[model samples]
Structures are given as C-alpha cells and as structure tokens.
Target: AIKCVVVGDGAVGKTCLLISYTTNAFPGDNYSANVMVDGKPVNLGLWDTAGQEDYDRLRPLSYPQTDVFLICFSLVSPASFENVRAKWYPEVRHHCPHTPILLVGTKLDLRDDKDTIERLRDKKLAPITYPQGLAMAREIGSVKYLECSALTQRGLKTVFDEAIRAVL
Candidate 1:
C-alpha cells in the first residue's frame, strides 16, 4: 500500500483535494481510493491530516508509514504559504526525514478570481505566483511542485499520480 499523507494550513482545502480525487465528488472522514498508475490499479491510502492546532499531537501518528507528503497551501493565502516552511515542512521532516515531499499550491481557481484579487488587495497582499511556488519547492527540496483546484479538478489527478510515482 502506498501511503500519501497531506498536510497544510486550516481551510487550505486539504480534505477537499482528497475527496475530489477519491470519489470525484466533494467530505467523509477518512477513506482509501483505488487509482490507476502506470497502467496498474494501485490502492492509494489518502491520509488527510487536520490543519487545526487541536490535532497537532495526533497528526504525526499518520506519518510513520507515509510514502509521500503533500505540503499544501492556499494560492491566495500568503499566511498559509508562509506556514509551509514555518510549520508544515519542519513537522513532516521531524517525523519522516527521508520521505519525498511535493509542495502543492491549492485553490488554483481562486488565484485569478476577481473577488479573490480584490479581497487580497484590501489587505495589501496578493495571490502566490507560480514562480513563487516553484522557488519554495526548491528551497524545501520537494521532489516536485504542483498546483491544483479541487473544485475544477485541474491538475488534481497529477498530484496523486506524482505522489504514487514518488514512491515507485
């Protein structure tokens, strides 16, 4: 079994990503999905860790057998992006030093939305750019950098597919 654990800031769409991938619908608690990779049906155990502080101590329990870790952040939330290195990376590395990580920018659909742009503008901030994601992926030594939207299903499959490939 390939274990893929996803970690990110709260409301960054971690659970949504899993739901979209597993059932092609959008949330149950925990579930496993069978996906085809390299022409073989593989059981990908999707572990969606809670991003809330209340679950901190319990979250690492899911890391031991992880084959790949997807460190996600909202494309429109700079604070979440900051937490990618400030919190998530350190937490994952402390548990699984050798596990491959894929930095994922979530909510791709919102990055260019007019409302999202205006909202961020009010705060004097803007969405994270593609190059910014790429730079962070390099800084964190992630195996790959990916961006996706669960609502639109863009680049969604590739995220899990690359995760499986990382283990292979």
Candidate 2:
C-alpha cells in the first residue's frame, strides 16, 4: 500500500479534504484503506497529521515511509499559503526528502467567494491567486500543484486521484 501523508496549517481544510474524499462526509482515527483511482484498485495508507504546534514533535512519526506528501494551504488565507513555504514544505522535506510532494491549495471554492474576499480585504489581503499557487509549487519543487474545495466537492476527488497517480 502506498502511504500518502498530508501536512499543512490548521483549518486549511486538510482534514476536510481527506474526510470528504474518504467518507463523502467531513470527518478520522488513522489507517490504511483501499481506493480505486483511474479504474484501478490501489491500497493507500492515508496519514493525516495534526497541524497544531502541540503535535510538532509527534507528526514526523507519520513521515518515515510516506510515499507522497500533500502540502496544503487555504487559498483564502494568505498566511496559510505562506506557511506552505515557511513551515509545511521544510518539515516534510526534513523528514521525507525525495518523497514526491504535491502542493495543494484547499478551499478553492472560497477564492472567489465575496464574503471570504471581503474578510481578507479587511486586512488588505486577497485570496492567493492561481499564478501564486503555481509559482509556489515551482518554488518548492513539488511534483504537482492542485486545488480543491471540500464543501462544494469541486475538484475534491481529483486531489486524491492525483495523489494515487503521484505514487504510481
């Protein structure tokens, strides 16, 4: 089974992304599961790590055999986007060098949401653009850059689909 570990900032929709895909409901303990991608059966051990600082010491325990890393950020949160470079990328590389990493910008549905835009605009910030995401993926040397929205289920399945493809 391939091990695909997800690392990102808190509330960036990492858990939501996984849950929505696995159960079609936003919610996990942790274990391996079988999933079919591209009409082929693939066994996957999906690891969801806590983004909180309290888990800083324990999260890497999930990294030892990671086949691919989904480094996520909220497209609506510039800080989370920045954390992709400042925190997630470094941490993942530190623990699993050479592992294929997919840069994922979650909450893609909100990037164009007026309310979300206004919230960020209140602080003089805006959603991270597609170009920015693509640039960051390049900057971090990721295998691919993708985006998805758990709430609307837009592009959600494609995220995991590509993950399985990343390993295969």
Candidate 3:
C-alpha cells in the first residue's frame, strides 16, 4: 500500500500525468475516468484525485494514505504553477508535515513565455539571474524542481523514477 497522490489546480493535466505514468494511457477527449493501482498490477497504491472543489471535503483523506505527493502545474499557465506553490504545497505540508513532495511543471512543449516576451517588454516573468528555484530548493529543503511536458514525454522518467526510488 505505497500511496502516491497527485494534486493541483483543475485542468493542470494531473489526470493525464497519472494515467501516462501509471497506465501508459490518456483520454482521447471528454472522458471521465477513475483508476487504482494494485500490488498485483503494480506495487504502487495510486490515487488520482479529481481537481474539483466538490472533492475538497475528501482532500484530507488524500494525505493520510499518501506517502508521496506530486504537485503538478502547466508551464503554459503560470497561475497553475503559482497555485501549486501557494495553495496546494502549503496545505499539504501543514497536514501531512512529512510526506515527500515533488514540484512538477507540465506542458513544457506548448511553448515558454519567451515567445510572448518578444512582442511585449514586461509581459513575461522577471529573469532570476541566479538559480532562484534551485536556491529555493535549498531553502525549503525538499526535492528538486522538475519542468517537463507530459504530452511530449519529456523528463517523465526522471521524476517518476525518482519518486519510485524514494517511495519504495
């Protein structure tokens, strides 16, 4: 019963990431699905949570069973990334206090902010000459920051393989 929970804002590709990593599958379009990973199938106890406010009542249940938490965000949407840092990260840390959390940036293949920055002067995120995230990683002292495209299948193995090793 090695439990892992995927949490993030709605439409942050949490479901797709779970399916891709666990089942090697993804929905075509407009599909509602729920899946469980069994020891017979895979030694991992996977819980793919729906990112709906209606399920907020059951969120605490997620952490109790969770040995690892994957906080996913979409690179195409900065707000999704911000929410992971703000809402989801802190809340999980408060409750679980000891669960290992992996901060993940999804949809890296869509395109970065650089393309839009060329058209507008200050439309993009300010540059941190220093390794802000790496530095912050040292400060908070959790795991590393991983940016990847679940759709493009970039950095997928790096994150999940690490999670498997850590959780197991």
Point to the candidate with the largest TM-score: 1
Prediction-by-prediction clash tally: 0, 0, 0
- RMSD for each model, in Å, please? 1.3, 1.8, 5.2
Order of candidates by TM-score, top first?
A: 1, 2, 3
What tens digits encode model 3's per-residue C-alpha lDDT throughout 100-135?
887776766655457644533355653221244444
The reply for model 2, stretches above 4 Å from the true place, is: 31-33, 37-39
Ranking by lDDT: 1, 2, 3
Model 2 lDDT on a 0 to 1 scale: 0.87
- Per-candidate TM-score against the hidden true structure: 0.96, 0.93, 0.73
The stretch of ten residues in a row with the least summed lDDT in candidate 3 is 29-38
lDDT of 2 by residue, 1-168 (tens): 898988999999877887787777766446556787667788877788899999999888878888899999999999999998899899888777789999999998888899999989999999999999999999999988998998888888787778888888
Compared with the true structure, what per-residue lDDT tens digits does model 1 show for residues 86-109? 999999988899999999999999
Which number leads on lDDT?
1
